[PDB]
Design a protein around this ligand. Structure first.
Ligand SMILES: CCC1=C(C)/C(=C/C2=NC(=C\c3[nH]c(/C=C4\NC(=O)[C@H](C)[C@H]4CC)c(C)c3CCC(=O)O)/C(CCC(=O)O)=C2C)NC1=O
Ligand SMILES: CCC1=C(C)/C(=C/C2=NC(=C\c3[nH]c(/C=C4\NC(=O)[C@H](C)[C@H]4CC)c(C)c3CCC(=O)O)/C(CCC(=O)O)=C2C)NC1=O
Ligand SMILES: CCC1=C(C)/C(=C/C2=NC(=C\c3[nH]c(/C=C4\NC(=O)[C@H](C)[C@H]4CC)c(C)c3CCC(=O)O)/C(CCC(=O)O)=C2C)NC1=O
Ligand SMILES: CCC1=C(C)/C(=C/C2=NC(=C\c3[nH]c(/C=C4\NC(=O)[C@H](C)[C@H]4CC)c(C)c3CCC(=O)O)/C(CCC(=O)O)=C2C)NC1=O
Ligand SMILES: CCC1=C(C)/C(=C/C2=NC(=C\c3[nH]c(/C=C4\NC(=O)[C@H](C)[C@H]4CC)c(C)c3CCC(=O)O)/C(CCC(=O)O)=C2C)NC1=O
Ligand SMILES: CCC1=C(C)/C(=C/C2=NC(=C\c3[nH]c(/C=C4\NC(=O)[C@H](C)[C@H]4CC)c(C)c3CCC(=O)O)/C(CCC(=O)O)=C2C)NC1=O
Ligand SMILES: CCC1=C(C)/C(=C/C2=NC(=C\c3[nH]c(/C=C4\NC(=O)[C@H](C)[C@H]4CC)c(C)c3CCC(=O)O)/C(CCC(=O)O)=C2C)NC1=O
Ligand SMILES: CCC1=C(C)/C(=C/C2=NC(=C\c3[nH]c(/C=C4\NC(=O)[C@H](C)[C@H]4CC)c(C)c3CCC(=O)O)/C(CCC(=O)O)=C2C)NC1=O
Ligand SMILES: CCC1=C(C)/C(=C/C2=NC(=C\c3[nH]c(/C=C4\NC(=O)[C@H](C)[C@H]4CC)c(C)c3CCC(=O)O)/C(CCC(=O)O)=C2C)NC1=O
Ligand SMILES: CCC1=C(C)/C(=C/C2=NC(=C\c3[nH]c(/C=C4\NC(=O)[C@H](C)[C@H]4CC)c(C)c3CCC(=O)O)/C(CCC(=O)O)=C2C)NC1=O
Lengths: 162, 160, 228, 172, 172, 162, 162, 160, 172
């Protein structure tokens, strides 16, 4: 759970010392971040369902073979589409959780830490999720510094994928 | 049973048993062999009846096993299957006795008060006996399934 | 930096000399001295990962530490220290467990022996908070026991876990000591409702043994040995 | 940590005498069928990743509460650890049917993992059902003869199902 | 090991949905008062050695049995360990009011130190009274104004006294 | 390099003892294996080029999208086909090397140890290689115990892939 | 308990992998060994009592002082002869156990691991047991490869003694 | 108990409780805390007491587990350990009550007639309680072992 | 880990006062007889291998079930471990009578080895009888005069038999 206040406490604890001005600098910086990041997370919460459906449709558009071939890993049947838009919503929910938490900790603990072996065991290409995250980071519709750090979290998920 | 009911019904009326009641007792006495066969059918396969009926019940009514329901957890689900075992045992008693006075006189009088004091939805218990009836009448021949489904029918009717 | 309060060492399998020749149940030893291949270095690295934190995911692995290890700049005890001060080991083990529980777990893994008593873990637990986890790991690696049994380039392992000509040795520290304690389990709310078992766990109430029945003591009657 | 042969040796040493003749005929028949034991073991081993993926595939279709948020195998890290736990159990089953003794399976998993799953909050029921389904699929994969000379595997289906049921009951 | 934000994130993930709006307004007010919270923290942190020395000063004036020979804090080494135990408790209080959650204070001290003081023969009552007096002096040092702009210090007196009472009750 | 004689020497060295009858049992077993395995490796060497082309054509048949979409990971252009039949021949050559060596060591050191991160970085699906290895293990045309252990090595590569 | 199947499982477990063709090579080799070794162990079981008495008489012949001097370590009295032919039969029984088990494991766990300190504490010369094992390996009367590996186990006991 | 015995002994004599009996009841009332501590010591470790005492008994008296004895077989050995569990439970009752009237008034009156009707050697049962006493007084402090060994002593004395 | 002198020092520190005079006269007599304590300790130490071999020699003559196959000390490795356990017990007895305190013997053996022998399946009775016979032979070897100036060793036979009985009772 790599969030700034948690890791500041971990630094001060591993050093064995009290808190210094460094952690207070970390804190006024974190409050500066959260002062826009919480409203941006609320805006993503508002636009979430349409973003999930648009990402799923873009993923079906770029990879049309997954809709066609019979296979339980592919979303040819309906249960594949339910499970697969479910993990689209999982990715978007982890993006909002990292927007609230202020660090890549929630996605690192809920998504990243086992995603490679899961995609290895289940024959899931990570490029599908890369395409979906690219569609989300194109279509989230935020502006300014909140948009840049949202794109930062999504690009972090992309780099963790491939 | 049938003999108890006929004796009591002639007993309040201050008369002996009428001959129609006597051939009723005679026909029940002759059909006791088929009643005992249905009872052995219900007794010998109680494990599969309780298991499959609990499976179909929790498939049908998943909220009582979800957190928040009554039968949530290991021991609560075990007590739920135990209550279903109790009702299948009373079904066997009512099959042998030829009447529902064992079932009613043991486990159906204050069933609403008891399951209201426990916090239990009684409709889900009716669904449990419905799935028990489905598995049990899926296990027998036609007239045997009808004769057992009469008592299963009485239990689900006495629930609601 | 006051000295530790002195503690009793309890009796253990490691405390005796022990007279064992090379058996199977003696654990496999991995030194950098007898391995030079790219292959043999990969096998040694996976063995050290297995001993320090039961399974190592691909994100869990440290490219820096293994990369330094294949040259020879880094000794295997420094690789053990790099695994110990690693952030994923701290996150999985130090954050979730209690302090005394963490000292217990890490003493088990690094020294290869169980702690002698609770008083020893209490004695060692003060170094962690007074000086940091780094100074505690530094104080734990340079003791007499680690330097005598493994040294600079031997991967640590459970010492005399299994006895000679025994069927069952002892529980491996990996399966025996989990990653987190019961407190963190209570934080997760982890006892999950399983209705799909209670269909198959259900036995008829006549078959269930009661307080007068001897079926409760039957497991003891079959577990006890009776001489001919 | 025992073989079949070391098991007979330890029993004969506890008796204190030499090995009797009937045990030697039993071990001769074991040496005749030990390769037979092995053929199932190799065709069991080659399909192991398919076995654990199909087992988790049926298990998480069967109990969607584990995949549901707040479930025990919900988190990606925890789900990878779950597949790791299953693959470990299958590997020690293959080891025990290699050596022909359940003592390796006991030694390596059984005595600790029940307490581990209690302490972790892991539901023992789901992993018990998963080991049962994995064992059913393993015997189903072993028994079919595809490009193999016809032979009798009857005893060894007995032994493999014994090992899988021992694992599933020690898990609980 | 949890923040305020990670606490809301873990609760929203256990719910399985997104964060509701009222929790976001609560977190916005938390982000507005988080600096509030921690100026308070900084004036608590700067006087820490004076706090622990005055706390031990009043405690050993209050219970002279600990200073008396045979007492638990009598020996010079043990007395230094006693001041170390008190300073550690104050430091983890400052950490918990930094992160705004009591889970760090729980994680780092509470579950083990009660059993530690039982096993050591340490009287839990004296250290409980010492943590209570240290907390009273800490709020008394935090609440006074000396060249600082007026602020809503009071809720945070609520939270700091909560953390100190949690520490004193977990010690017992 | 997990080959039987090498690992027997490693066992005897880590135990600190001389060689016993156990390693000689390992040896008469290894010679029994090699007595057919060397001729089977020669037969695979003979049929190698047609097996490589057949595996590449089966891979293009089952996954027709890779021939169509523009992308440097896909074999749409000609250089993709050269590189991709090159790694088909790589897989077949590692199979023959493990047939000669008598263990999974050569494929474990030359293929398996980094294949997951390579397929992660390069957007290569491992299912392509699984299909190719399945075609090879169907079409190698050996018989008997050599065929069974050849299928063992190929199935080991499949399980290491996914 | 260094037996080939046990140590193969230990190799595969310490490596963390499944079984490969290496362990199956170990297995067909072990079955090849046992196919004569079990009958040779039965033949040694048949000739055991006369071999024990002949070894004891050869030991009394080469070292005649042990029959003469008073001492509880020496077999001058009758209880020394009972205990000492008992440990002759112990050595022969461990030889048969290693013949059945297929490795030096049973003698290594039942005899070798403490024999040096026992002979140190009890004033027993190991050369007595070396003479007895030499008489056994001369007079066991087997033939062929079973005889060679029986002599291998007895020579292993000799080298472990001195 | 002590209060029952004092009340009955004053009750036959047609008198009130004498002051010596009253300070007897008072001393028992004060020593009840140590009695409850001995009872928790005996209750919490009943598994190891029954297991180790059965092991030492069958080591000491192997003929009752040999074919021909009473406790031969799985269920017979389980019933033997159950009888030992019964006697340890009565030991705990007598420890709490401060007197042996629970032990005697429950499980010692017709013990000879019962174990003669079952075909059981009563000396081997006395050896079972002897091994239970050895394991139990090996588990406590000195005065606690003496106070528990008084009731164990009464049980072995009431056997023979 | 205590001496005689450190025992008096710890008791005087728990009292909190200086050492009283009668304890100093007792320690002066201890310093006069401490050499007396230990020349014998030296004659106990020099014959240690003979003591443990004669003790095991009488014990395995006395209980032939341990030498019998299936017995606890039957196997050569286990028999060497048995002689090692006995020699360790004798060595810590010699240490405790060197320092003049039983706390070293308690610290190094007693609290753990009873549970060790329970968990191992080691019969505590045989090793208790062996430690008793070893102690009887040790006092018998210590008490005889063969070229040593005569002295009254009555309290040191007392102390050595105390240490041996403490070891035998802690073993059980
Ligand atoms: C909270 C973070 C989180 C993630 C990311 C996650 C992914 C995840 N996706 C899974 C399956 C899946 N994932 C997909 C997704 C797709 N397949 C396609 O064809 C589409 C391109 C794409 C749609 C987005 C599908 C269809 C399945 C079901 C296939 C299966 O049986 O394994 C599984 C196996 C569970 C199961 O079999 O039902 C996991 C663990 N789980 C998590 O807990
Ligand atoms: C060599 C023998 C051996 C075994 C058996 C073993 C089990 C084991 N499983 C664990 C976790 C786990 N095991 C499971 C498995 C499951 N949970 C479920 O929900 C399902 C019922 C089941 C899937 C079949 C899961 C999900 C965890 C993760 C718990 C966590 O990380 O919090 C842990 C905690 C540490 C960690 O994985 O990284 C151990 C020690 N370890 C061993 O060394
Ligand atoms: C590691 C490489 C390797 C393999 C693969 C191997 C297999 C193998 N299986 C064999 C026998 C056999 N294998 C089977 C197996 C079966 N028959 C059935 O009908 C069942 C469905 C199935 C088991 C489920 C049978 C029945 C035999 C008969 C001979 C024997 O008992 O070994 C034999 C005996 C010798 C021979 O065939 O030349 C070999 C070689 N040997 C090796 O060295
Ligand atoms: C990070 C969390 C953490 C805590 C809380 C902790 C407590 C802790 N306090 C200890 C000792 C102590 N703690 C105290 C404190 C007190 N005793 C008294 O008389 C007073 C009631 C009280 C003063 C407030 C004393 C006197 C000792 C010394 C005991 C000894 O050395 O024998 C010890 C024994 C080892 C040692 O200090 O050097 C531990 C482990 N350790 C930790 O790592
Ligand atoms: C780590 C170094 C550091 C410190 C020390 C720091 C303190 C600090 N306290 C502030 C505000 C404040 N601080 C307080 C604190 C209080 N008012 C009261 O009357 C109470 C008694 C007391 C709390 C107990 C208040 C009321 C404010 C008003 C502004 C705000 O809400 O931040 C601010 C707002 C920005 C500014 O003042 O320029 C700063 C800088 N900032 C830093 O970067
Ligand atoms: C000796 C063991 C060994 C293997 C297995 C190996 C694989 C391997 N394949 C690669 C690329 C490739 N792999 C493929 C293969 C395919 N793509 C498809 O569409 C087809 C389905 C499949 C044809 C078999 C292709 C087309 C490339 C070039 C793509 C690239 O730029 O990275 C690369 C990156 C090097 C490069 O970019 O040229 C490696 C390392 N290298 C090795 O040394
Ligand atoms: C199963 C493997 C095994 C072996 C090898 C073994 C040897 C063994 N031989 C012993 C004694 C002995 N060993 C000998 C043997 C001899 N002395 C002679 O003069 C002859 C040359 C030779 C006759 C073979 C004798 C006479 C004793 C009794 C002497 C004694 O008190 O210690 C003892 C001490 C036990 C005792 O004192 O009775 C052991 C442990 N025990 C084992 O469990
Ligand atoms: C609380 C007072 C109390 C006692 C003592 C008691 C004993 C009692 N012991 C019984 C059986 C038994 N009890 C024993 C016990 C023993 N045989 C041996 O060899 C050992 C010496 C010994 C135990 C260590 C055996 C073997 C039986 C079975 C007798 C039979 O099956 O014929 C039975 C008949 C089956 C049953 O219903 O349990 C009773 C009632 N019941 C009581 O209410
Ligand atoms: C410093 C204090 C200390 C003590 C006391 C100690 C005892 C000790 N004795 C042991 C074994 C043993 N101890 C004995 C001794 C006996 N068993 C018998 O049959 C006789 C009753 C008795 C001979 C007097 C034996 C036979 C074993 C071997 C058990 C085995 O290897 O399976 C073991 C198991 C590990 C091993 O020896 O190699 C320990 C830890 N260890 C210590 O570090
Ligand atoms: C470390 C090397 C060393 C040894 C061994 C040693 C022994 C030693 N023992 C002595 C005395 C003595 N030692 C004994 C011992 C005993 N008498 C009995 O009858 C008892 C059975 C037995 C005790 C159990 C006695 C009685 C004396 C008389 C003188 C004295 O009190 O010291 C003395 C006095 C000075 C002398 O004899 O010249 C010496 C030197 N001194 C040394 O420097």
């Amino acid at each position: 759970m790599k969030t700034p206040l948690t890791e500041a406490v971990a630094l001060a604890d591993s050093q064995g010392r009290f808190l210094s001005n460094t952690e207070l600098q970390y804190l006024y910086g974190r409050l500066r971040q959260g002062a826009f990041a919480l409203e941006a997370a609320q805006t993503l919460t508002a636009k979430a369902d349409t973003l999930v459906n648009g990402a799923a449709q873009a993923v079906y558009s770029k990879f049309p073979y997954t809709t066609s071939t019979p296979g339980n890993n592919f979303a040819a049947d309906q249960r594949g589409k339910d499970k697969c838009a479910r993990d689209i919503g999982y990715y978007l929910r982890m993006v909002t959780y990292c927007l609230v938490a202020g660090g890549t900790g929630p996605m690192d603990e809920y998504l990243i830490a086992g995603v490679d072996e899961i995609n290895r065991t289940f024959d899931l290409s990570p490029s599908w999720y890369v395409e979906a995250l690219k569609h989300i980071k194109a279509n989230h519709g935020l502006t300014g510094d909140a948009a840049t750090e949202t794109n930062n979290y999504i690009d972090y998920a992309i780099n963790a994928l491939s | 049973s049938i003999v108890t009911k006929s004796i009591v019904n002639a007993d309040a009326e201050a008369r002996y048993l009428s001959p129609g009641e006597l051939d009723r007792i005679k026909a029940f006495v002759t059909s006791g062999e088929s009643r005992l066969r249905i009872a052995e059918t219900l007794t010998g396969s109680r494990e599969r009846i309780i298991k499959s009926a609990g499976d179909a019940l929790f498939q049908k009514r998943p909220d009582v096993v979800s957190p928040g329901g009554n039968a949530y957890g290991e021991e609560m689900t075990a007590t739920c299957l135990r209550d279903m075992d109790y009702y299948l045992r009373l079904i066997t008693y009512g099959v042998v006795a030829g009447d529902v006075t064992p079932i009613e006189e043991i486990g159906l009088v204050g069933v609403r008060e008891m399951y209201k004091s426990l916090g239990t939805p009684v409709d889900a218990v009716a669904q449990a006996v419905r799935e028990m009836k489905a598995v049990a009448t899926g296990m027998m021949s036609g007239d045997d399934a009808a004769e057992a489904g009469a008592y299963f029918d009485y239990v689900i009717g006495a629930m609601e | 930096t006051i000295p530790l309060l002195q503690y009793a060492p309890s009796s253990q399998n490691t405390r005796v000399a022990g007279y064992t020749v090379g058996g199977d149940e003696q654990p496999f030893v991995f030194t950098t001295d007898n391995v030079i291949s790219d292959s043999d270095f990969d096998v040694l690295i996976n063995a050290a990962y297995r001993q320090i934190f039961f399974h190592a995911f691909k994100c869990d692995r440290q490219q820096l530490l293994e990369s330094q290890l294949r040259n020879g700049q880094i000794t295997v005890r420094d690789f053990i220290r790099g695994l110990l001060l690693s952030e994923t080991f701290i996150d999985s083990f130090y954050n979730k467990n209690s302090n005394y529980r963490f000292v217990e777990q890490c003493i088990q893994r690094v020294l290869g022996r169980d702690p002698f008593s609770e008083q020893e873990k209490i004695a060692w637990s003060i170094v962690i908070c007074t000086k940091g986890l780094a100074a505690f790991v530094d104080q734990l690696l340079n003791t007499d026991e680690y330097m005598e049994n493994f040294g600079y380039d031997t991967v640590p392992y459970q010492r005399r876990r299994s006895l000679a000509s025994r069927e069952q040795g002892e529980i491996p520290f990996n399966i025996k000591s989990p990653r987190y304690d019961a407190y963190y389990r209570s934080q997760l709310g982890f006892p999950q409702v399983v209705w799909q078992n209670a269909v198959r766990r259900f036995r008829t109430p006549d078959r269930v043994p009661q307080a007068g029945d001897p079926a409760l003591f039957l497991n003891m009657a079959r577990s006890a040995q009776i001489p001919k | 940590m025992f073989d079949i042969f070391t098991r007979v040796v330890s029993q004969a040493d506890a008796r204190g005498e030499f090995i009797s003749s009937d045990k030697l005929e039993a071990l001769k028949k074991v040496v005749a069928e030990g390769t037979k034991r092995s053929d199932a073991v190799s065709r069991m081993t080659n399909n192991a990743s398919s076995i654990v993926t199909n087992a988790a595939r049926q298990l998480f279709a069967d109990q969607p509460q584990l995949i549901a948020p707040g479930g025990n195998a919900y988190t990606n890290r925890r789900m990878a650890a779950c597949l790791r736990d299953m693959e470990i159990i299958l590997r020690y089953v293959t080891y025990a049917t290699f050596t022909g003794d359940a003592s390796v399976l006991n030694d390596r998993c059984l005595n600790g993992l029940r307490e581990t799953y209690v302490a972790l909050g892991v539901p023992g029921a789901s992993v018990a059902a998963g080991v049962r389904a994995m064992g059913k699929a393993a015997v189903a994969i072993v028994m079919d003869p595809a490009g193999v000379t016809s032979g009798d595997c009857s005893s060894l289906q007995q032994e493999i199902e014994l090992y899988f049921e021992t694992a599933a009951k020690a898990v609980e």
